[PDB]
Amino acid sequence: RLGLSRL
Amino acid sequence: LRLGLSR
Amino acid sequence: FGPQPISRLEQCGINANDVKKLEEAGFHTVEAVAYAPKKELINIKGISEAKADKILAEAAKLVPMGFTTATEFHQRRSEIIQITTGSKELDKLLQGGIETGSITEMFGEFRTGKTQICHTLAVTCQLPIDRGGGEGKAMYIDTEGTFRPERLLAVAERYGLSGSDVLDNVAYARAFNTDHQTQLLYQASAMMVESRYALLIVDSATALYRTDYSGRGELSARQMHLARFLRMLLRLADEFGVAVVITNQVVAQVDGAAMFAADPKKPIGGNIIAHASTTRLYLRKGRGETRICKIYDSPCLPEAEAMFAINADGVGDAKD
Amino acid sequence: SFGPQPISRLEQCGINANDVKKLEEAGFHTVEAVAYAPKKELINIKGISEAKADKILAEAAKLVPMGFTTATEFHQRRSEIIQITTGSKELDKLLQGGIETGSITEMFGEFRTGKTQICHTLAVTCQLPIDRGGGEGKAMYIDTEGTFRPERLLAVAERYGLSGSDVLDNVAYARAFNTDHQTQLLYQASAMMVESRYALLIVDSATALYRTDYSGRGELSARQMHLARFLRMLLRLADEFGVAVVITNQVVAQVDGAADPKKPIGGNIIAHASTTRLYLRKGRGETRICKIYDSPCLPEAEAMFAINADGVGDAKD
Amino acid sequence: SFGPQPISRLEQCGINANDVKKLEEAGFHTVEAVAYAPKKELINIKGISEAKADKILAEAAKLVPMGFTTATEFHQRRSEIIQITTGSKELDKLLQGGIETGSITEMFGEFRTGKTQICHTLAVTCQLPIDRGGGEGKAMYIDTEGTFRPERLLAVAERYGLSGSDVLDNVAYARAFNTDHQTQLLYQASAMMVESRYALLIVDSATALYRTDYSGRGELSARQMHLARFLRMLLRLADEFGVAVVITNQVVAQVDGAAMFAADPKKPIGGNIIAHASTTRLYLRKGRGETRICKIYDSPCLPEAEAMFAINADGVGDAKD
Amino acid sequence: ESFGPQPISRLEQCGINANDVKKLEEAGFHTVEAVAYAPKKELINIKGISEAKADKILAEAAKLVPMGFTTATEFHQRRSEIIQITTGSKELDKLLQGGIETGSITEMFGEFRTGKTQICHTLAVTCQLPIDRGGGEGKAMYIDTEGTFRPERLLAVAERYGLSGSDVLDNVAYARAFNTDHQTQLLYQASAMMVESRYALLIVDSATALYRTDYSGRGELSARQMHLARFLRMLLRLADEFGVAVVITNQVVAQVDGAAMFAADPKKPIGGNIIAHASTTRLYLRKGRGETRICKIYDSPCLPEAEAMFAINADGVGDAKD
Amino acid sequence: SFGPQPISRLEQCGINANDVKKLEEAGFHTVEAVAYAPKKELINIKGISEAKADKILAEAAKLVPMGFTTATEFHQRRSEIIQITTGSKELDKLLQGGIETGSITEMFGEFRTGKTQICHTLAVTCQLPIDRGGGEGKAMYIDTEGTFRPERLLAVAERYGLSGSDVLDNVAYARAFNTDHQTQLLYQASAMMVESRYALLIVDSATALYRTDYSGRGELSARQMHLARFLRMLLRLADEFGVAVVITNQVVAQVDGAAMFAADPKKPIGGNIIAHASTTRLYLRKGRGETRICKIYDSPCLPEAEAMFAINADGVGDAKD
Amino acid sequence: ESFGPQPISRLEQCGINANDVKKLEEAGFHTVEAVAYAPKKELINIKGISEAKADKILAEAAKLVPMGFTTATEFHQRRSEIIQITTGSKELDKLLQGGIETGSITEMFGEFRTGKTQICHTLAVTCQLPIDRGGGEGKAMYIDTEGTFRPERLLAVAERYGLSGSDVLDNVAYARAFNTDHQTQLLYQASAMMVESRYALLIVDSATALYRTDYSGRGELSARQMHLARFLRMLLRLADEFGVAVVITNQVVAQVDGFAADPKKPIGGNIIAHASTTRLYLRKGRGETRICKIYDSPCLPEAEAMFAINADGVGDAKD
Amino acid sequence: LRLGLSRLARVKPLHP
Amino acid sequence: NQSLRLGLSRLARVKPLHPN
Amino acid sequence: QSLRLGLSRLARVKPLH
Amino acid sequence: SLRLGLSRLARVKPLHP
DNA sequence: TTTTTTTTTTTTTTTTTTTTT
Ligand SMILES: [Ca+2]
Ligand SMILES: [Ca+2]
Ligand SMILES: [Ca+2]
Ligand SMILES: [Ca+2]
Ligand SMILES: [Ca+2]
Ligand SMILES: [Ca+2]
Ligand SMILES: [Ca+2]
Ligand SMILES: [K+]
Ligand SMILES: [K+]
Ligand SMILES: [K+]
Ligand SMILES: [K+]
Ligand SMILES: [K+]
Ligand SMILES: [K+]
Ligand SMILES: [K+]
């Protein structure tokens, strides 16, 4: 994971 | 018999 | 999707006292332990070499620490949230807004509006995803004491949000020295592990470093402390996936070799903060209430300039 | 047969056939790897006797050539070496063909000079046909800053006329959070590289994490030692699979007021370990200047390139 | 009769052929090698007893003198030694003739100083006729960093008017991958040099592999002992075959001191073992542009002085205007 | 007069058969002092010699050599006229109160480029000078274990002192040692040549260089130390026999222990307690600035610890030029 | 009649002169020496039979005391023992008076620590009167290293206000070339003590020549027996003439890893024989500058403690502030 | 009661003339218990005995001394009333289960400075303590061969236990031996003098030191051993004639061949190994502490104890 | 001997 | 015999390695 | 006469100096 | 008479006349 | 079926900007 997910 | 110094 | 709590590792086969020691040390999350090397765990008194060895070797299993193809990375990064700055031109030049998971750093002289940008981002962070927000709470670590909870109300009124929930959704902390800054970062991680946060503002990052450390004798210590602080920020960004935003001041080139142009203004911090910062913005004063933002360093964004303004509702587009 | 011979050949002339798997667990996946290793490394492995290590070394030595040879054969072999085009004609002319394989090239400069841009351009161009200047193989990218953007790879691939999907599929990516993870990634790369054909290994950057992982002068010594070991491992790869190793470095300003006031970090260890060194400086606008800071055969000179929307290329006048 | 005596000379002295073969397989290829070795080495090898080792030593000593000679004879003999020109007139004047044969010369310095360029120039110039500064012999190159480049050799050969083909033909090359292979390279070189006339042996670099192979202060003693054994082998080779041994070294920065040595404190690595073992030491430093400075760190018959040379497209030479 | 040692042929007139004299000469006892100073075990070790023969030889040797008690005044008077060899430097001469003494052992140690070989060359040249000019009036012997003998320095010092270079080179004997066994065996030949001609100096450079690589590992330590002790005892026997001045060279090793603390000189001589106890005088050489070096008396039974400064000029070791 | 009686007194007891002369030629110069000698050693000299030796020992025991004695008399006699000042007040305080006669005191340590200096200081202070702490007698020096310097004696004599010529004339000196020569010098000493009064015996070093005379593990047994005989004879002399014997020693490094934990990885040579033979043991170590530390290692009446002395131009003294 | 030694003079009541009694006294027999515990070989070796008077004196000593079999109950009753001398250390006394046994040979060995002489001094001065405090209520004997006897330690320990120095130095007899023959003659004199008064201890320090240098080499070893044996037997005879406690000290040698952590062996051989009853091994610990181990004992199990040597003598560790 | 990737070597087209 | 040799004496008659 | 363990302190001898 | 070293007063033929 | 201890060694690793009249 790289950051907060848009989905 | 003798076995040592007598208490 | 969120970080796995350290309690998930309790049933994994270790003592609860070790978990308590890790929590009191500062490791509140499993991947926080995983990202740490053996040296940090060994430095913790009460943990033996075998204990740290098994802890790391078993914590590496849950988190992926191996090779992956670039296609998977591109697919994963295609769904990264970007927080709008409240200006259409700024969003256009940022190609979406402030990226989440990296370090964004604006710098400039006085009146540029770094604090205004920070306040606007802090308010906007709570917006829904479809409205440009990040759908999460925000915090403000202030070192200059220039936090006014009245601009936040104006920006909330612009977007049709009530003042009360916006105000209570924003955490505030003020630091008076670098050690307090580090403890504030530790406390920020502690509060992040039990809630949802999306933006962390550290205005200003190196404002206290000019005064706390003086002279050439303490230059190395100041630079290395700044490097440690930036590493802590980067670790927080990796672990929690929040967007970190800092702020720098400028100094004038008195060397006299800047005759090629007329702009003796370089950010302070030097190579450490130049390399650590993923994205850099340079702010310049324009006409009246309008300012200009230019990309300084960015791995993907080109070198372009945009024009914005600071109106009564916050940062927005300049009125023609 | 030209590539490395897998260690499975060792059980063809005679071996216990069980210690081979255990050497694979140790990290040696090639007869060249075990042959290049000293006896001390084999002894260090728990459960290997001195006689067993001696027999393994003797068996591996008889396969790989490790004797003397006339310099004319070395000249013939060097004339056949491959080089990868950087992306700009000027830099290729300065490097007399491009990036040499089997050696170590280090690029250093201040911020925004374009180390990562050149790294992406190389990672794309290494898949080009050999007649077009490519390395004809996949690429590996170890990133220690979270600064890997596939959009640049897509742009450069579109510029070169390839397909973006295959270009992305043919690049391996890893991220390291500390130095120990960097070494573990190197070991995993050594294990992986024997299956597929690779040509370029990129480290970006090699010494970013060493600045903060080890604190103060008291922990300096050990830190340097670790770095040395890391570099040695890289050399081993260049001696085994023939890939080109490219690493990036940061800079530090000289505070003592002596003598450009920027020097690469890592010290004499990385100064001696690197075979070629490139100093990058910011130019006017989107142009940058590259200087040959150290080379065993390339004369000291300078060249100019640029970072356009399709990666690193020739500057436009 | 000027060259070393082959081991077959021991056959006519009454020595068993099988023991001669065993000695040849043990690394002794000349009568001088047997004479210069103690009885312990002959005892250690399998198949030789105390009596036979004593007989071999006596027969070997009966062939090569090992006694006392007047200093005038030594002066007369040393007046006819061969010194190889390094390619620069200023460096030649500094070294009073060039690189001396039969002694260990070690050049150390920072990166890009020019050790490899000097090595390549010496390797090419060792093949020149005697009355031109050369030594009229082949050259060896033991490389531990993969920096050998025949292009520089071709350039220097072109500069000196020789032919590239035979210049490249008369150079032997080998690459070492660890310390043990570096050691056995000398064992192979002994036979390769008893086969044909050689003038110059290059080791570049001697200490680079030792740093990574032996790590920490736990393995310091073994590393130093191995380095001492390697240097002793080099000294034996130079004494027996009368060749010029040139080795290169690396440097480290002193975290302590600083004020003690204000000339950018940088000391050669290897320690007292390599400090004592080497006969001549040359400190290389960068000047301006392509010009470099060579200084005599240690020498038994040379005053401490500095000189300036340059690395031009045709090799190591004298700096121009 | 009768200052020189009595040759072994003196045993012929004392009732010892010529065959036994020849056997002793083969064994290395070229002087009456040598046989008189040896224990009965060494003579018994010689093949072809019986216990009675060894007893008679020892008694006859003891007849001609004094071996009893004497007052301290006689020893002081005898030591008053001893010959001290100048080092060429006034400061080093004053530090040692005359220079290197004859009949004893002097060992100098330090790091590289200190100047041990330079001092050895200067002493070798100056030992041929007349007595009134600080010399010893005798030849010089140079046992070399490193291949670092340079006649150019000898000629330079001879030119400085006004002597003839050809004669100076003619009056110096040179030998090279390739291993420890040869180094030990050279001393018998040294005695053989020193019996018939007067020698004032004997140089070993360096004594412990070969022992570092000849005996490698901790398991071979005992044999190495025993061989070194035997060599040092042989050197002492030579010094007490012919009255020559024995000078030996030593190396150094760094103290990785780290217990030196504020002491910024973590260098100790190699060789160990054997060479520490055996050596009489010890000098520590350190680098100063430029071409100047500092010598300190590490160990001496009659010389206090101090420091002196000396420069290696083009004419050898001498006084520094202010 | 405090001093030992001459063996000539045996003639008055009914012993012929030639028998006394034979006994003297055997090395006995005192009636106490005859009395303390065993029967087997009496038989082993030519000219003496079983009855003759028995009669000689009978009259010897007649002339000497060998019965039991109450401890009060022993205490009263021991309270009148004689001690010799070392030279430093701290050392005298540590030793409770200083060196004690009639016993064996050994000093051992590293090089340059000051064994020979202490021996010289003792040899000059032994001639001082009883009030000043001296021994009021001559001294002997046995030098097995060629390290006897009369200048130190002259300097200390000038420090104490004595006469240089007199202090030089009252010290005997002997150099030993081998162990057999050491024993012969001991015989000559035993002959000499009976005619002139002495108060100190110095050996330096007792075990210096034993290292090289007996080499290897093969000759350890004979070396140990020879050392035991030498120490027995020193004890015999001390018991006969009541002189303090002081022997120096040399140390070796404890190569075993167990000594790493210990702070003194150095042990005296000579082993159990010299460990048991010696009564008092002093361990000398170097302090700072020109000062040393002396520690009690083994003593029947002195606790473990350390002193602090120094070596100055006038010999052994106190550490000047 | 009939516990003290029975004087030889009462043999006059058994028809034995005074000349024979005087001759046996001159030989070295002073009690009837001694002659009874002596075969006819030495009796016939004496001048003036012609196999006629020897038989009758031996028969008289046999009827005057109990020599027949007895049940183990009386032996247990006699062993339960034995007197053990306190060593001054509680841990050492617990290790020895009471102290040093009387009527038996106790031998101690160890490296230098381990404290054999200190313990010997402590025992020699504490053997005079009252019977209720662990003493033996008797005098002490010190046969010294190395010349390391110091009354100062006796005075210090006497001050520790609260006695008089002059009154405690009067009850300790001392004698120095210069060779083995003198040592045996001192044993003879001790046996002669030990009937006049009451004794409890006899110390030989060290028993085997003069034998190291008196008999040197392989060619004279055997005789040496034989001599030693004789000496040891005499000691045992004393332990039966008067019941005193015999304490003898020993030196050590280093084993040069091939292992264990104790490369030290007691000099003396199997003769002294068998002759001695109880054996103690002394080792140097840390500072002033030493470790005592039981090497050989017929009843005491192997165990280790720690004891210190303070300025007041042998004592427990200063916690 | 091999010093790295050689141009004169058959390789399957990685990007056909 | 040629006594001792150290440095490839310059009077040695060696065939020319490079004839031209 | 009596045991002496060295030179007597009270012994009166002529001083050397 | 004992000898300790080379004698200054001894007559030695000079080597450099 | 007795007896006797011994011998030291090896160096190492760089760092960090500043401030306009
Ligand atoms: Ca602000
Ligand atoms: Ca980058
Ligand atoms: Ca190089
Ligand atoms: Ca030298
Ligand atoms: Ca001494
Ligand atoms: Ca004792
Ligand atoms: Ca039994
Ligand atoms: K402001
Ligand atoms: K950056
Ligand atoms: K380099
Ligand atoms: K040197
Ligand atoms: K000494
Ligand atoms: K003792
Ligand atoms: K027993």
Residue numbers in the entry:
A (entry chain B): 333 to 339
B (entry chain L): 332 to 338
C (entry chain A): 20 to 339
D (entry chain C): 19 to 277, 282 to 339
E (entry chain E), G (entry chain I): 19 to 339
F (entry chain G): 18 to 339
H (entry chain K): 18 to 275, 279 to 339
I (entry chain D): 332 to 347
Please, what does the article write about this entry?
The central protein in HR is the RAD51 recombinase. RAD51 forms a nucleoprotein filament with single-stranded DNA (ssDNA) generated from enzymatic end resection at the DSB site. One emergent RAD51 modulator is RAD51AP1 (RAD51 associated protein 1), a protein that directly binds to RAD51 (15) and promotes its activities in HR, thus contributing to the maintenance of genome stability. Our studies reveal that RAD51AP1 acts as a RAD51 modulator via strengthening protomer–protomer interactions, promoting RAD51 oligomerization and reordering its DNA binding sites, thereby facilitating filament nucleation, stabilization, and strand exchange.
To understand how the two RAD51-binding sites of RAD51AP1 enhance RAD51 binding synergistically and how RAD51AP1 stabilizes RAD51-ssDNA filaments, we sought to determine the structure of RAD51AP1 in complex with RAD51-ssDNA filaments using cryoelectron microscopy. Consistent with its binding across multiple RAD51 molecules, RAD51AP1 binding tends to induce filament clustering and bundling, preventing structural studies using single particle analysis. We therefore first attached RAD51-ssDNA filaments stabilized by Ca2+ to a carbon surface on EM grids, then incubated the grids with RAD51AP1 before flash freezing the grids, which resulted in well-separated filaments suitable for single particle analysis. After selecting particles in which we observed extra density on the outside of the filament, we obtained a reconstruction of the filament at an overall resolution of 3.1 Å. The reconstruction has well resolved density for ssDNA bases, ATP bound in-between RAD51 monomers and side chains of RAD51, allowing us to build a structural model of RAD51-ssDNA filament. There is additional density on the surface of some of the RAD51 monomers that could correspond to RAD51AP1. Using AlphaFold3 (36) to model a complex between a RAD51 dimer and C59, we obtained a structural model that allowed the residues 329 to 349 of RAD51AP1 to be fitted into the extra density. The quality of density corresponding to RAD51AP1 is limited, probably due to the heterogeneity arising from the two RAD51-binding sites across two RAD51 monomers, and Site-N having a weaker affinity for RAD51. Interestingly, both in the structure of full-length RAD51AP1 in complex with Ca2+-ATP-RAD51-ssDNA and that of the C29-bound Mg2+-ATP-RAD51-ssDNA, we observe continuous density located N-terminal to Site-C.
